[PDB]
Design a protein around this ligand. Structure first.
Ligand SMILES: OC[C@H]1O[C@@](CO)(O[C@H]2O[C@H](CO)[C@@H](O)[C@H](O)[C@H]2O)[C@@H](O)[C@@H]1O
Ligand SMILES: OC[C@H]1O[C@@](CO)(O[C@H]2O[C@H](CO)[C@@H](O)[C@H](O)[C@H]2O)[C@@H](O)[C@@H]1O
Ligand SMILES: [Cl-]
Ligand SMILES: [Cl-]
Ligand SMILES: [Cl-]
Ligand SMILES: [Cl-]
Lengths: 19, 229, 226
């Protein structure tokens, strides 16, 4: 399941998602 | 394609984290001319949030690098890359603002939806303002502020202080003040008023309404804390 | 355009997390025909790993959706095929650079093994989404690339060398996942693990910083697999 490759507080803004 | 095929493809693309595909699907849905359902609106909004968000994040990284580099051909490289990203960003925002003008805002049949789309117009002009320079900037900033202000008046008249969209508008409009107009005092006043008017009615809410409202109330609270400390 | 300039653009694209831009830069660098520096080799590898990785991830999600469902089950299939085409294009892109520039120009065993392993890897990604007739020829090209890398690394590299270890790991995974032959997979990973531990029993110091962690991957597969 594993293979390998070798090498040499911000302000909030909001999106409302109404159901 | 018909609407349902487009909507299901948008949902597939969302699952596959392919947001450009997702946005193209929902743009086509919007362009069929019927008022969007809450679900279609959410898919559209989430798609473009991710598409423009990737550019905003990249822009801030490359802007920072450009500003922190003893000039060289290095600074010019970063400048040009920044401008490449800005063009993508502007095209994305113009697309959204055109959908808002031609379809979304005209078709909005309820106060809730109307405030939502005007807030969204304020947001995407705000993203243009983040990246605007000189002559164009003032005009863009005014367009953002006018969308937000109109959203604000309708929400005040038509919605409960605890409504998540009324609260979320207050949040992003306060961010606009703080960050785009560099007016901290108005930003904090706006945010605090929305917060205080919501707690005063928090007893009205059901178990579920309460959770919706309190999530955005926390965001107002935390922005305020950040800005007054 | 200046190579050093393309390289600095690649690094900018990387920091901005725009990996398609990053890959396009390193591709142009490769096409200039000079042998890649170690830095350039890493940037190229990292760029395409991310680019192809996004499609592989998308492909696995959309396949899993397609399985767990007649009109929706077919929409997924045609989306999956759209993703497969991007994926195949990316793999063919990489495999062409390897064939035309990287592998023939590699003047060191370490670079040559690295690129042959990369060839094995990208043919493996093609085999992950290959169907019917074409799959067997893809699978064979992957195996021959790995095998060629393997023979060189056995002669020229220490058993604990991270590239030699990473090759044994990926080649063993290929045997298991692509050829479904854990008898070959276990044997190769075991032999590779045993040779590396014999070296560490002899020397006082590990020669490379990442040897032991890759060795762990080998044994864990050896224990997980038979
Ligand atoms: O990422 C924005 C950038 O992408 C391009 C294609 O290279 O256009 C895509 O995105 C636009 C904005 O959403 C869409 O209007 C367009 O249909 C889509 O191909 C560029 O044109 C744009 O600058
Ligand atoms: O994502 C793969 C997809 O991208 C396209 C452009 O839409 O091609 C780009 O990626 C290829 C693979 O790395 C490059 O060979 C090509 O030069 C680059 O523009 C498609 O052609 C491809 O399917
Ligand atoms: Cl479409
Ligand atoms: Cl719907
Ligand atoms: Cl609170
Ligand atoms: Cl270099």
């Amino acid at each position: 399941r594993i293979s390998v490759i070798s090498t040499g507080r911000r302000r909030q803004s909001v999106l409302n998602l109404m159901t | 394609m018909d609407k349902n095929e487009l909507v299901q493809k948008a949902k597939l693309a969302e699952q596959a984290e392919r947001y450009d595909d997702m946005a193209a699907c929902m743009k086509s849905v919007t362009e069929q001319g019927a008022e969007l359902s809450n679900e279609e609106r959410n898919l559209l909004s989430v798609a473009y949030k991710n598409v423009v968000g990737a550019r905003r994040s990249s822009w801030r990284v490359v802007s920072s690098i450009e500003q922190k580099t003893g000039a060289e051909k290095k600074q010019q490289m970063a400048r040009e890359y920044r401008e490449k990203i800005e063009t993508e960003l502007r095209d994305i925002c113009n697309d959204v603002l055109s959908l808002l003008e031609k379809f979304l805002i005209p078709n909005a049949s309820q106060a809730e939806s109307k405030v939502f789309y005007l807030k969204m117009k304020g947001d995407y002009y705000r993203y243009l303002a983040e990246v605007a320079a000189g002559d164009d900037k003032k005009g863009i900033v005014d367009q953002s502020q006018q969308a937000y202000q109109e959203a604000f008046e309708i929400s005040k008249k038509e919605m409960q202080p605890t409504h998540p969209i009324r609260l979320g508008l207050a949040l992003n409009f306060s961010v606009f003040y703080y960050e785009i107009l560099n007016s901290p005092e108005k930003a904090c006043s706006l945010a605090k008023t929305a917060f205080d008017e919501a707690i005063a009615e928090l007893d009205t809410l059901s178990e579920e309404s309460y959770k919706d409202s309190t999530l955005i109330m926390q965001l107002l609270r935390d922005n305020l804390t950040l800005w007054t400390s």
